[PDB]
């Protein structure tokens, strides 16, 4: 059990690690944000 | 010249309607209207 414990709380520690050290983690979020700013600012551009 | 109220303005013959202000836009001298991404005029040289 401690062992087990353990593996799991090291685990949930290398999960802050891994987020924060790899941009393409969030990448599938962040192109939500991108694709959705470019297809507005794309409508905008049209109007010239 | 009447500002920080909604007016139908006409400067040089360009119309439109809108807020005017005084702005920190740094127009070099041969400048008379800025454009935004649209087209749309978004600042003028007050012509007197």
Redesign the interface.
Known sequence: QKLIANQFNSAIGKIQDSLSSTPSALGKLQDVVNQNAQALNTLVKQLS | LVKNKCVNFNFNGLTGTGVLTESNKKFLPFQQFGRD????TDAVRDPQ
Do not use: G, V
């Not at chain 2, 991404?37 to 749309?40: V, Y």
């Open positions: 991404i649209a087209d749309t």
